[PDB]
């Protein structure tokens, strides 16, 4: 009516405004820099002990301890240098689909089909890990969660909303609305001033932690978005979706920069992460293996095969030493 | 070698044996996924259980003839069914509830849901236990109103049992994989133990078939 026309003309104006900034392209600018060699990586460790599909993992900030969550109702904290199990937390609900590890190292988090984000305290005087909080208030499954400052946490659910919580009081400090489909992942900015969310409406949004407002909206994908990750610079990000393609967007240019797709890949993408310098892009697929792309050339530089089922989680340490990949065959592998 | 890393390794091994024991104890459980459309007789099925805080998934434990059954109710999700269904890829069976007394074409919605679930790419090799609830109201309505309204191609009489069999076979022939999986059908009755005995028999049959596939036969 009188407002759909307004929305359509605003959208057309936005498209024209972001069309005038495309003087060049990242590909034709990077056309004259040396390509990276064939990236060949070795499996240093294999972490066994999970008895079901591993759905999430997260590295410690010291890049030695990592947390993994499986569908058998278990959290395991591994010391990756020696493959020792530091802690094994039994969860009340076996249906866990995400996990996070606090930047300080004192707490971990879980969530899933029970719509509750559970916060567990690792450093207790009693000598055992006990649940510290149960944040409830979402009306859909938790799909991701990221600790912010050891006392507040950002979560995303299948009720098409994200939230920022306060662990002491247990109540939603902020609620982020504006998506249309399920929100499947989020990524915090390095300075924790902004974050990005990718939803099943084939769109990504850039939220400001303060003021609870959506800065920019990015489109270009064809299907549901399953993964997202900020560039180390903090001025760009990458998204993986179900159309077997990755996209690199830039915040300042407010438009798509590059796409990473191949004719031999038809399966969707489950996870995405960057390298320490941002030159490499790691992506996990449903065809049972991971792909290492050149972030500036958009051509595969390596393949990480060795998993017998879909690769579901993927992470890179804070110093860039190793890459941990976990799949649905209940194994995690450290690559270097 | 190791100074007090040996104590860390010993703690890791104790954690390993506890994990293995928990896995063994959890592998002796029967897990069933309970599905339906719009509370169409789910309550009268769960009422045979004998053992707002959590609104995402509902657990149900019971025990029959020393066998422990776990039932999962996911009717309060309201999300995209394709985003979380693969979590239940390994359940022993899917208990699907259909209300026979149907009026705003709800039978078509039930048939659509059954068609989607049965031919799903994750639930290959997973059996389905169909529960046709509310047969007395079906008796009454078929006495008053024929079945032709819901299904225009009904070329039979208004007799209760032949129309019920028609509905049963018209549900059962939606199974595209007539050889990979089997469908067990039941008409829920007021008797308390009949439903549980039917579920026990179906689970026994599906366990026997799974062991046939695992133990090298077939």
């Amino acid at each position: 009516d009188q407002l759909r026309q307004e929305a359509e003309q605003l959208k057309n104006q936005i498209r024209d405004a972001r069309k005038a900034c495309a003087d060049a392209t990242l590909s034709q600018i990077t056309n004259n820099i040396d390509p990276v060699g064939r990236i060949q990586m070795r499996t240093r460790r294999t972490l066994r002990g999970h008895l079901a599909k591993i759905y999430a993992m997260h590295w410690g900030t010291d890049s030695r301890l990592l947390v993994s969550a499986s569908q058998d109702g278990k959290l395991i904290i591994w010391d990756s240098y020696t493959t020792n199990k530091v802690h094994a937390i039994p969860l009340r609900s076996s249906w866990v689909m995400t996990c996070a590890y606090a930047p300080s190292g004192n707490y971990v988090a879980c969530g899933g089909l029970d719509n509750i984000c559970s916060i567990y305290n690792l450093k207790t005087r009693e000598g055992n890990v006990r649940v510290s909080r149960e944040l409830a208030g979402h009306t859909g499954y938790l799909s991701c969660c990221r600790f912010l400052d050891d006392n507040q946490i950002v979560t995303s659910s299948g009720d098409t909303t994200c939230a920022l919580w306060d662990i002491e009081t247990g109540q939603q400090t902020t609620t982020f609305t504006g998506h249309t489909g399920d929100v499947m992942s989020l990524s915090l900015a390095p300075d924790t001033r902004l974050f990005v969310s990718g939803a099943c409406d084939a769109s990504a949004k850039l939220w400001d932690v303060r003021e609870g407002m959506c800065r920019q909206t990015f489109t270009g994908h064809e299907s549901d978005i399953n993964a997202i990750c900020f560039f180390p610079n903090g001025n760009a990000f990458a998204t993986g979706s179900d159309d077997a393609t990755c996209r690199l967007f830039d915040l300042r240019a407010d438009q798509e920069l590059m796409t990473y797709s191949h004719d031999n890949i038809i399966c969707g993408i489950t996870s995405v992460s960057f390298s320490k310098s941002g030159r490499l892009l790691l992506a996990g697929y449903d065809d049972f293996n991971c792909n290492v792309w050149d972030a500036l050339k958009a051509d595969r530089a390596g393949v990480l095969a060795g998993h017998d089922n879909r690769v579901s989680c993927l992470g890179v340490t804070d110093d860039g030493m190793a890459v941990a990949t976990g799949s649905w065959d209940s194994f995690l592998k450290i690559w270097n | 070698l190791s100074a007090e890393d040996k104590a860390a390794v010993e703690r890791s091994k104790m954690i390993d044996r506890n994990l293995r024991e928990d896995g063994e104890k959890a592998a002796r459980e029967v897990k069933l996924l309970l599905l339906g459309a719009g509370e169409s007789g789910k309550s009268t099925i769960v009422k045979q259980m004998k053992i707002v805080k959590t609104t995402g998934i509902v657990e149900t434990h019971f025990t029959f003839k020393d066998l422990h059954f776990k039932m999962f109710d996911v009717g309060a999700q309201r999300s995209e069914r394709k985003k979380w269904i693969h979590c239940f890829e390994g359940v022993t069976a899917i208990i699907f509830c259909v209300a026979l007394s149907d009026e705003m074409n709800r039978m078509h919605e039930s048939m659509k849901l059954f068609d989607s679930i049965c031919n799903n790419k994750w639930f290959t090799d997973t059996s389905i236990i169909l529960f046709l609830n509310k047969k007395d109201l079906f008796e009454e309505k078929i006495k008053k109103s024929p079945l032709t309204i819901c299904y225009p191609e009904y070329a039979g009489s208004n007799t209760y049992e032949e129309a019920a069999a028609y509905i049963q076979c018209q549900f059962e022939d939606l199974n595209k994989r007539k050889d990979t999986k089997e469908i067990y059908t039941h008409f829920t009755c007021s008797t308390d133990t009949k439903n549980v005995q039917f579920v026990f028999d179906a689970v026994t049959d599906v366990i026997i078939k799974n062991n046939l596939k695992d133990c090298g036969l077939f």
């Epitope: 530091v86 009693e126 000598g127 | 104590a7 010993e10 703690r11 104790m14």
Partner: single-chain antibody
């Protein structure tokens, strides 16, 4: 969390006793347990260790054969059954918990100790200084020295600093030569290299006096060395 000891008293030589240590307020099954001994007006001396799950058991050379450590986890109790009691076993016995994983702090909690009286170690660590006169406005340095390089091939130096106040049980100050234990004021600090280590107190108070001990956790005999006394 508390450890409570019982079973002390006067015993004739050659007899036998059983000391009990009841633990309340923590997961007793997850902690390894140590029995430590302090002779009257002498330094600490490790006696026995039992692992979690009763897997590994270690005894001191001077008490091996006539002592037996055990635990009963359902009742949360730790027993030391000692036999052939000599006149050198008169002391106070402390019960110490210690949990080992990556980044843990063993020896953090000590029991009160029970007194037992009897009527008529390839690494040696030396604390050369025996007493130091101080005022509650300065900084104090306590030096410890080892006969072996406590630094291990994995980058960890296994030195622990304990403090015993007059009339109390020792408490963990520093673990692995650099890390402050939980609930310890920031004024304490530790450093060193391989064979020579130092504890530093920036600004003392009235509660910083007592006897300081430096234990090793590299080879399992776990020698202690006579402490350094701070008074006035």
């Amino acid at each position: 969390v508390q450890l409570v000891e019982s079973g002390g008293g006067l015993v004739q030589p050659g007899g036998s006793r059983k000391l009990s240590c009841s633990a309340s307020g923590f997961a007793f099954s997850s902690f390894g347990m140590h029995w430590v001994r302090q002779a009257p007006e002498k330094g600490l001396e490790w006696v026995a260790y039992i692992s979690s799950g009763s897997g590994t058991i270690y005894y001191a050379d001077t008490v091996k054969g006539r002592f037996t450590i055990s635990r009963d986890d359902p009742k949360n109790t730790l027993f030391l059954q000692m036999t052939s009691l000599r006149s050198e076993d008169t002391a106070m016995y402390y019960c110490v918990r210690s949990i080992y994983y990556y980044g843990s702090s063993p020896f953090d909690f000590w029991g009160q100790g029970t007194t037992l009286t009897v009527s008529s170690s390839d690494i040696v660590m030396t604390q050369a200084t025996s007493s130091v006169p101080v005022t509650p406005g300065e900084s104090v340095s306590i030096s410890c020295r080892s006969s072996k390089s406590l630094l291990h091939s994995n980058g960890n130096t296994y030195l622990y600093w304990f403090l015993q106040r007059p009339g109390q049980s020792p408490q963990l100050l520093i673990y692995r030569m650099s890390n402050l234990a939980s609930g310890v004021p920031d004024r304490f600090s530790g450093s060193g290299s391989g064979t020579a280590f130092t504890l530093t107190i920036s600004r003392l108070e009235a509660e910083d006096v007592g006897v300081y001990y430096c234990m090793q956790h590299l080879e399992y005999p776990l020698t202690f060395g006579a402490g350094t006394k701070l008074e006035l």
